[PDB]
């Protein structure tokens, strides 16, 4: 019987929530993942650290499409991120598409994921999620946006930010290199330059996972006939494209 009907996250006498801070500590020890918002798209990149080289690198996707216009990356505990991505994909339909006929905007999906995580930090017999999420999305009425979601259930909009081990150092780079006139290719280049310092092993398209929320891809719709339905804005960059952009650094 599930007799753990009490909160496992409680306020300490100092006011801190122990499990929240410990999940944040687990996040800080995760691999660095960053995101940069440009004027014509957003970029999210991370290091695809593989344990054994016998492992299939494609079967370790750290960036996951939530909606055709909204993707997400993480830093922290992989499995928590995976179950959160599943819950997010499900709530994007059960709470918006099946009610309004359209996919949710970035802020609403981010708020739903934050609500899930907050429930995970207060419900009975559950630990908080050990992940921080970077969600990059585009909707028609709010344009492009990038959000950070913490285990505490709080989310913040960012022009650019990194999370993980060397995130602080990476953030400094972004603070020195970000401007409100950036292009999507310039944002990808800055993301590559920022991730180059956060990694120590090989720095190629097989060790980096990068995705973009940019223009619509009508070639990725799978069907042609409805001119109103454009293509998906989320696109994961292939290893060949990553290497082609790395050769010009």
């Amino acid at each position: 019987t599930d007799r753990y009907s009490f909160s496992l996250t409680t306020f300490s006498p100092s006011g801190k929530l122990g499990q929240i801070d410990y999940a944040l500590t687990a996040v800080k020890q995760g691999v660095t993942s960053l995101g940069i918002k440009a004027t014509n798209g957003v970029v999210i990149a991370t290091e695809k650290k593989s344990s054994s080289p016998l492992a299939m690198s494609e079967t370790l996707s750290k960036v996951s499409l939530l909606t055709p216009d909204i993707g997400a990356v993480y830093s922290g505990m992989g499995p928590d991120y995976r179950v959160l991505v599943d819950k997010s994909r499900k709530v994007a339909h059960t709470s918006y598409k099946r009610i309004y006929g359209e996919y949710p905007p970035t802020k609403l999906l981010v708020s739903e994921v934050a609500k899930i995580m907050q429930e995970a930090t207060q419900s009975g017999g559950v630990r908080p999620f050990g992940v921080s999420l970077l969600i990059a999305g585009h909707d028609e009425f709010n344009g492009f946006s990038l959000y950070q979601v913490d285990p505490s259930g709080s989310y913040f909009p960012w022009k650019a930010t990194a999370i993980g081990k060397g995130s602080v150092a990476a953030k400094t780079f972004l603070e020195k290199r970000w401007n409100d006139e950036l292009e999507l290719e310039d944002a990808i280049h800055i993301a590559l330059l920022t991730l180059k310092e956060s990694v120590e092993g090989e720095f190629n398209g097989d060790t980096i996972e990068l995705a973009i929320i940019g223009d619509e891809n009508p070639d990725l719709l799978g069907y042609t006939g409805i001119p109103t339905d454009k293509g998906p804005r989320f696109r994961k960059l292939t290893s060949q494209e990553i290497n082609d952009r790395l050769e010009a650094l």
């Binding site: 499990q19 999940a23 687990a26 344990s51 054994s52 928590d80 630990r127």
Partner: protein, 242 residues
């Protein structure tokens, strides 16, 4: 001190129960490797029958989940049988609801999500087992996918699990660096079984009889387990090899 009894975060941001379940996976002191061929997948596991009163035919850590998916477990046999029953039920439910056989990676992801649930829920303990599913997916070819008590799941060109896992892993890495391919370029599955057994002999440095190994072979739309006589015939063919 209670942070090391239930699946909650320690001050260092770790889950000690998950690490102790990982430790318990090696309680059986049995190693197992898995490799992919041109059109098949072979798993080899150690068969240790310490008691003379035991029925050797019942001592098994390989399970036929479906007609296409097999699973070898590293860990105690109670949790092994629990995971095996759950995987068989999930495969049956998948085939019923979606009208096609459950893919290997999908079953691995389902079991890994259940493991993540056990990792985030405090009412139940993580299963101290590491599950290696193998199949010949109709869209992916030979496939090996492993899941661990932490909720992680990933595919492999080849893999190993057990106390001597690092040695077998390094041996397979060296062979694949030499061959410069991601599988075993052999047409027949018997030669792939022979290769796997041979490389396990090389890694562990100990010889095996027909009653010391368990072999599971997955080909297109059929997973089976070799008998002692087929294992012995493969061992004879390995002894003939120079």
């Amino acid at each position: 001190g209670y942070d090391r009894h239930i699946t909650i975060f320690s001050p260092e941001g770790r889950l000690y129960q998950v690490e102790y379940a990982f430790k318990a996976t090696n309680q059986t002191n049995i190693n197992s490797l898995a490799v992919r061929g041109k059109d098949c997948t072979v798993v080899i596991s150690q068969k240790k029958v310490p008691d003379k009163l035991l029925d050797p035919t019942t001592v098994s850590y390989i399970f036929c989940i479906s007609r296409t998916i097999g699973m070898v477990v590293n860990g105690p046999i109670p949790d092994a049988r629990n995971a095996a029953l759950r995987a068989k039920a999930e495969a049956a439910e998948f085939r019923y609801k979606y009208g096609y056989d459950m893919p290997c990676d999908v079953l691995a992801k389902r079991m890994a999500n259940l493991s993540q649930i056990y990792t985030q829920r405090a009412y139940m303990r993580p299963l101290g087992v590491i599950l290696t599913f193998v199949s010949v997916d109709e869209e992916l070819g030979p496939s090996i996918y492993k899941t661990d008590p932490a909720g992680y799941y990933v595919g492999y060109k080849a893999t190993a699990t057990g106390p001597k896992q690092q040695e077998i892993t390094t041996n397979l890495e060296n062979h694949f660096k030499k061959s410069k391919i991601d599988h075993i370029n052999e047409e027949s599955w018997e030669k792939v079984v022979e290769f796997a057994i041979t490389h396990m002999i090389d890694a562990l440095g100990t010889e095996f009889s027909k009653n010391d190994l368990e072999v599971g072979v997955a080909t297109k739309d059929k997973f089976f387990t070799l008998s002692a006589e087929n294992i012995e015939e493969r061992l004879v063919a390995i002894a003939e090899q120079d």
